[PDB]
């Protein structure tokens, strides 16, 4: 009926474990496309392993970082690591290929995307709360922990070709953002906004109004390409 | 009157805002002069903030991150970051270049270089005093603490240099040791001496001897050059 | 008499200073055979100095990094750090060359290598333990922490190389596992099922036993080689 009342049911859905296996299957896809990936499975399945680790959890390895807890404290959630472990070996080592390509269907693909485009906002949000709570006026805290909470493995890209044997320092995601690198800059600093109180809108609303957003924008890009 | 009471006023003088703004100026000078600065303040103005940022305030980034702290703790200092901010636009995109200019005079260059060291030697004194605080007889962590307070962005130049693009992997400050390194690795261990109370002097009396001893050097090295 | 009380004392033997001696011993050995290592230790002696703190104190910064302490907490053991720095001295720069070739003689290198095991099993165990009493169910910050502590400045190779001036991007610890570190990961994964009360074994017997596979591999590799 109402609007609001859409957007709260809309900024309450549990993301574990549907929607976190969505962002999970997107991220280690983006994986098995970088080069040399298969084959690293292949060799190194350990570090193979670690590096589909970064693109699952990277988001919370850099906040924890940044606010001086332990990188690897959101690895306690033991169900969640199981389950990114799960798709990591389903993607590279399914007999035949079947989940690959069963994911990589293009409608699949897609509604994939859009759920991760959900993860990613709410983790975004949680950011600047998180940070806030420790800061109550660390504008600029609130503003870093929400970028790497949307960003994720892309700000420490350079690291994970360094763990995969590649080194190409030229480029960085800071000195040239990607769509996402960017897009997550401008939504932390909207609910960075709003928890200033300075945006007059509800944090259901933003939340709803920028997933749809990332959404579109994501499904449009992926679509395309 | 009595040297003991002009020293006391000398090492309580408020950084807070002049002579920070002299160390954010210098600071962001030194940036301004490294290859490809100008040039990536015009195409990646975001990366071209945040390498100010580390200039400004790279002490405080190294020493929270040897203490185990949020690495970015300093950055709730809202005032700090908006004057370092302000420095940074200024010395990069001040109309006809003007604010460069009035800065890079050398009567007044001399003057804010001076004001630096009188930051630097406050900011290692106060890097021992914080670590004595957690260790109290941490002698190892309290010359690491008012080492890396005092020397800076240095110790971690060759992440400075590949966040704009540079890799430069032959050579470090801890290899080859730059003389403000090498400065602040003596400044530390006297600090610590006068803390471990083996050192027969007043903490006062230190700071103002040993910020002299880096006044003269920094300015005759300033000027020479 | 008994198995298990032959294994209590033996996994209770004070590691300091004797078997922490020989841990020093042997790791910076290895440091002196590193290609440049020798003519670093004479041009730029304190970067040799910090080196040589990396390969005996590398598992304690790597956990209390992992674990979101101070990565220089073990440095507040003001007679660790002292015994190592006597270790270094001696290694680099005794007259006639005295100490390496005493430590050097095979008969007591081997003993040396044998007592760097007894060391390194108990830091994997000690790894295990703490991790666990910050998170009873972190099976996967048990594993790490364990890993780390028993690996040591191995899985930091690439930035040991950098702050010697030396850049081999191609390859990692992580990516190629050297026998040490796998052997790390087989004992961390041990040492975490006994934690678990999945696998039907004491504390101390694990030691005793683990320990044994490990002086006997790296003894006869050593002999080898
Ligand atoms: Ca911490
Ligand atoms: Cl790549
Ligand atoms: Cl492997
Ligand atoms: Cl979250
Ligand atoms: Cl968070
Ligand atoms: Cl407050
Ligand atoms: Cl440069
Ligand atoms: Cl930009
Ligand atoms: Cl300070
Ligand atoms: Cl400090
Ligand atoms: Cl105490
Ligand atoms: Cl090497
Ligand atoms: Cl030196
Ligand atoms: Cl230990
Ligand atoms: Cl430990
Ligand atoms: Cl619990």
Redesign the interface.
């Known amino acids: 009926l109402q609007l609001g009342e859409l957007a709260a049911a809309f900024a309450s859905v549990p993301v574990f474990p549907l929607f976190d296996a969505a962002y999970f299957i997107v991220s280690v896809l983006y994986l098995k496309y970088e080069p040399g990936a298969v084959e ?1 499975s292949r060799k ?1 399945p ?2 193979s392993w ?1 590096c589909a680790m970064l693109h699952c959890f990277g988001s919370y390895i850099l906040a ?10 959101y ?2 959630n ?1 169900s969640s ?1 199981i389950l990114a472990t799960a798709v990591w070996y389903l993607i590279f080592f399914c007999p035949m290929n079947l989940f690959y390509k069963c994911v990589s269907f293009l409608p699949v693909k897609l509604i994939f995307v859009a759920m991760k485009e959900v993860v990613r906002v709410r983790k975004i949000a949680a950011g600047v709360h998180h940070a806030h709570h420790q ?1 109550h ?5 609130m503003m ?1 922990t929400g970028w790497v909470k949307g960003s994720g493995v892309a700000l420490m890209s ?1 690291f994970e070709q ?6 190409r ?4 995601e ?4 990607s769509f996402p690198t960017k897009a997550s ?1 401008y939504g932390t600093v909207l609910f960075t906004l709003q928890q200033t109180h300075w945006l007059p809108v509800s944090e259901a609303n933003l939340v709803f109004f920028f997933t749809m957003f990332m959404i579109v924008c994501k499904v449009f890009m992926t679509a395309t390409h």
């Open positions: 690293m190194s350990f570090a670690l924890d970082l940044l606010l001086g807890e332990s990188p690897i404290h690895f306690s033991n690591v800061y006026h660390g504008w600029f805290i870093a350079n360094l763990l995969r044997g590649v080194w320092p030229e480029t960085n800071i000195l040239h953002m800059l």
